[PDB]
Design a protein around this nucleic acid. Structure first.
Ligand SMILES: Nc1ncnc2c1ncn2[C@H]1C[C@H](O)[C@@H](COP(=O)(O)OP(=O)(O)OP(=O)(O)O)O1
Ligand SMILES: [Ca+2]
Length: 269
DNA sequence: AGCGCTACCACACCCC
DNA sequence: GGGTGTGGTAGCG
């Protein structure tokens, strides 16, 4: 109840035959989610970075299908982000990154593989869920200085109550590595200034977290997220949709497969 | 006209 | 000297 108060109190201050199409832009994030409620269509909220170098964002509301239609060519709608709605069920995902200069002998492949091998073990012990690297969409946005990878888990009929509970799960199973201010040593890496922190970014599990979309780049640079070469997740091939659209749907954190046997995973801190 | 939030420091308090 | 709860802005993500 304390969260919805900050949203309502910020709102009072902020105010002081064509084919079926839905394409609404909103200056405020709250306005977008309000429209989603009074919509009835399977619509979702995206965030676009404005030409301003800062993180100033505008919020687009439309379906996953229509969005990809005006987005697949990559001539327009660059620097887009998925708004992971709070309280909404979502997939297990990761934001992985370390500074290459400050970490000479850190192999990016073995680190992500060992990380997956560990989380999969954790999913088995705590929740009985079983999966392997074959269920992990591996994306890359690395440069010559930053090894940047996004992992989106594609679990069979499983999801988390929301992204906050995802964070409680990772802080829990990554506590052995958090103590290093289960041999989770490969997680520790030297940051920008040689300070030792974790290979896993635990700051992407907040309410209404933006998350850069598949084939999008930050407004600054020009390196877009793309599927790695060692990725082991392959969507099912369908004749009614393109393979790129399959990866796009898989990459969406808040696009949980509709299933009549869905298990919702929770985790309190 | 983005939206969330904690890492950090400062202070106030208590304890034998 | 240690230890614990409270503000409150700067700054990351
Ligand atoms: N100023 C911001 N405002 C809102 N959301 C942000 C902001 N900065 C980062 N985020 C969100 C979107 C990002 O996809 C998410 C992860 O942060 P970040 O690591 O800086 O971007 P990224 O991981 O997608 O690219 P990369 O790590 O390769 O630089 O946090
Ligand atoms: Ca990142």
């Amino acid at each position: 109840m304390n969260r919805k108060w900050e949203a309502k109190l910020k709102q009072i201050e902020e105010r002081a035959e064509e084919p079926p199409s839905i394409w609404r832009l909103f200056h405020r994030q709250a306005q977008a989610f309000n429209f989603v409620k009074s919509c009835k269509e399977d619509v979702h909220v995206f965030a676009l970075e404005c030409k301003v170098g800062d993180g100033q964002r505008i919020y687009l509301v439309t379906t996953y299908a229509e969005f990809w239609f005006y987005y697949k060519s990559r001539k327009n709608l660059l620097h887009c982000y998925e708004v992971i709605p709070e309280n909404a069920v979502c997939k297990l995902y990761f934001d992985l990154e370390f500074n290459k200069p400050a970490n000479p002998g850190a192999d990016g492949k073995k680190m992500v593989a060992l990380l997956i091998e560990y989380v999969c073990k954790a999913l088995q012990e705590l929740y009985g869920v079983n999966c392997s690297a074959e269920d992990v969409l591996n994306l890359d946005s690395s440069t010559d200085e930053k090894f940047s990878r996004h992992l989106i888990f594609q679990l069979h009929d499983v999801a988390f109550k929301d992204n906050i509970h995802v964070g409680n799960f990772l802080r829990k199973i990554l506590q052995p590595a958090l103590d290093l201010l289960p041999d989770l040593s490969f997680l520790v890496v030297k940051n920008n200034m040689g300070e030792k922190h974790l290979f896993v970014d635990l700051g992407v599990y907040t309410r209404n977290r933006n998350f850069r979309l598949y084939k999008s780049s930050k407004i600054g640079k020009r390196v877009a997220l793309e599927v790695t070469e060692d990725n082991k997740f392959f969507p099912i091939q369908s004749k009614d949709v393109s393979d790129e659209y399959q990866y796009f749907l898989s990459s969406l954190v808040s696009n949980v497969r509709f299933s009549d046997t869905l298990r919702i995973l929770t985790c309190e801190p």
